[PDB]
Design a protein around this ligand. Structure first.
Ligand SMILES: O=C1C=CC(=O)N1CCOCCOCCN1C(=O)C=CC1=O
Lengths: 411, 10, 10, 411
């Protein structure tokens, strides 16, 4: 120290390389949102499991051709039919109903005309089939959508709603997944007060713990609030021990120098980097600690509030994604057009922005937060602008030029 | 993929 | 430059 | 024969590699349009050759500052002034007039107010200078645009109007250039009649000689019409000898087999290719003949009229461009959007088209000729569409997709 400056590329790769993948556990399928499957999932039945009608109509023998037919009955959703359709008969079907024995096609109701109904008008008796059915027409055969024994979801699948629905479909209600990381957050600094406190001299309200907790929660991971910790070895070492004991990940912000000393000397953690050649984020620190053959990760983020949130999105979120089993945990980076000119720094530079798609324009505009219309000054950040380092060729970027933006919010 | 921003070639 | 038409990579 | 199929790429490169560069000659600068300089051109005087006023105003001493001044005279375009401007005097100047001795700046007329004029009102006597001139203000010093001894045009420059004007400027009225190729065109085929003839049985009017001559002339090169030649050794060999004797380049169309036999056996020419894997243009033939340590080039183009014009633009025009000294003689190829779907052939395919730029669209549309609105069916071809060979991935191109088009006309 001052620790060597690490490049942004090496810092990032080092985070992903060194972060572990959590172990697995069995969950109920309804809790599967955002989880990664740690098993292949197979169907144990056919979908549909019976030949099913695609249409409201009549189940027929295609060989009978067009003509006048006795309706022997009705097949409806949820009931197995007990009658066999013989030559010159048909059975009424609704969409999804099983096809009875002896019928090999369905003619939709619009290709028919009813001849006779019961006196009370509740019951159709005879119908004119107006078309020549193709065999198997308007029937979903057994197993058309899913076959028994088929693998419907592969291990490594990152599950959303449709995958939860596929589990339900196949009746696989308990599944093996990766664990979610438990994330403990503390703040440090003698100047900090709880949000709930009135100001005292020399002090400000701690906002990072709140912003960082919210960031992590927005991604779905459980969190632990470790509060404000006195910026001294004794309280830092204890907070850090309580974090290590309670969580997979510990994030601190502030005091980055007692912090880096406790990690190395008192905790015996390997600090992989302590300064990053980036803007903002220069003092960011990443360390791992192996105890139990369990690897803990520790992020010591800058105290400055803008820096704490940018660094959390660049480093922490991808690490958590890896921990929870996502095979490629890297963030989504899209192309956008700058809304304003911008001088480049020699450091790679990151800034919160709002992404907006205008009428029939293929690229969204990226508007840097804090400088704003009314409605635009009100909007929440959904991107992180990723500005290139200054060069001899590129010293300045202009409104309208094409830039990289990391997606950090719902679009 | 890169974590450091680029200029556009096109 | 190619005398033989090419397709567009973009 | 059937001669080996040559690829379009090898055929094209072979034409450029084997075509010679013509010798040089001295011409008058007014005849320089389209010529390539075979010498560097140097200025032998300064432009301007005297200090010249940029503005209508007054030549002043900047040291006199603002104030009231006697006007001692007028400097005008085309006359050397004989008076020296002393402290408290000025000389009227017009744009381009030489600056007299003793003045070191020009103040424009709008930064002045006239105090007194002669009784008759023809002659200004005294003027108020309202500004502090920067020294050398509104003067073009000697040699500001061109310096004596400077190279104003480099050898290899392909001259247009502004270059002709630069020659005039520097007084270099005779210049060394490459020769233009003399191009002899004949047609062959027993079915052909002159355009001026009424049809006889079995015959059609020869259109290729006319289209090919016009194509070459549109590029500025002298041509020789060799007429229609009987498709037999005796008349072919004589026409070919008269072409060789009269021209640098001989283009034939039709009869491609007495033609290829005369070239090889009777003329002793090296046929470099006789079939090209292209559409149209398959039977195209290129040969050279060295006599005098002078290399003649011979193109035997297909008789089909569409093929003759496409092949002339692909092969002949670039060769002529090389002959006349153009350092990179390759044609300009631009990107356009197809106006219609098109099935690809396994052969690279070329078709005349019309290029049109629509309101604020960055790519022009390419519309294939012959299928056409009224005004569009009337327009003259300014492009050659260059379609890619069929592959497993690309079998068809669609309206709106981006294609290569060779420019063959004024845009
Ligand atoms: O680099 C770009 C720019 C657009 C785009 O799709 N890419 C990735 C593929 O292009 C490779 C290099 O392209 C540079 C030249 N080029 C254009 O400007 C547009 C197409 C194209 O190939």
């Amino acid at each position: 120290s001052p620790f060597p400056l690490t490049s942004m590329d090496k810092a990032f790769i080092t985070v992903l390389e060194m972060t572990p993948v959590l172990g697995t556990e069995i969950i109920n399928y309804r809790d599967g949102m955002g989880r990664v499957l740690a098993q292949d999932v197979y169907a144990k039945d056919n979908l549909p499991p019976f030949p099913a009608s695609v249409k409201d109509g009549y189940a027929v023998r295609a060989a009978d051709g067009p003509g006048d037919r006795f309706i022997i009955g009705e097949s409806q959703a949820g009931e197995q039919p007990t009658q066999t359709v013989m030559p010159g008969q048909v059975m009424r079907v609704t969409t999804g109903a099983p096809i009875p024995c002896g019928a090999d096609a369905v003619v939709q109701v619009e290709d028919t005309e009813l001849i006779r109904e019961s006196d009370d008008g509740t019951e159709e008796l005879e119908v004119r089939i107006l078309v020549q059915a193709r065999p198997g027409q308007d029937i979903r055969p057994i197993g058309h959508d899913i076959k028994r024994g088929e693998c419907v979801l592969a291990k490594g699948t990152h599950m959303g709603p449709s995958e939860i629905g596929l589990l339900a479909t196949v009746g696989v209600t308990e599944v093996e997944v990766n664990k979610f990381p438990v994330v403990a957050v503390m703040s440090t600094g003698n100047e900090l007060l709880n949000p709930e406190d009135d100001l005292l001299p020399g002090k400000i309200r701690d906002s990072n713990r709140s912003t960082l907790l919210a960031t992590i929660q927005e991604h779905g991971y459980p969190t632990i609030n470790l509060g404000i910790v006195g910026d001294n070895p004794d309280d830092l070492l204890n907070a850090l021990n309580e974090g290590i004991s309670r969580a997979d990940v510990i994030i601190t912000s502030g005091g980055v120098d007692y912090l880096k000393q406790v990690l190395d000397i008192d905790l015996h953690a390997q600090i992989h980097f302590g300064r990053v050649f980036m803007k903002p984020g220069l003092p960011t620190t990443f360390a791992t600690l192996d105890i139990d053959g369990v690897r803990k990760i520790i992020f010591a983020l800058p105290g400055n509030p803008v820096s704490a949130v940018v660094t959390c999105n660049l480093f922490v979120v991808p690490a958590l994604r890896k921990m929870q089993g996502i095979l490629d945990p890297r963030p989504t980076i899209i192309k956008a057009r700058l809304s304003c000119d911008v001088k480049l720094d020699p450091r790679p530079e990151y800034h919160r922005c709002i992404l907006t798609w205008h009428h029939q324009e293929p690229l969204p505009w990226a508007q840097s937060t804090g400088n704003q219309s009314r409605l635009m000054s009100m909007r929440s950040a959904n991107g992180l602008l990723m500005l290139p380092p200054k060069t001899e060729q590129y010293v300045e970027l202009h409104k309208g030029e094409v830039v990289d933006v990391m997606v950090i919010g719902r679009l | 993929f890169n974590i450091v921003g680029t200029t556009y070639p096109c």
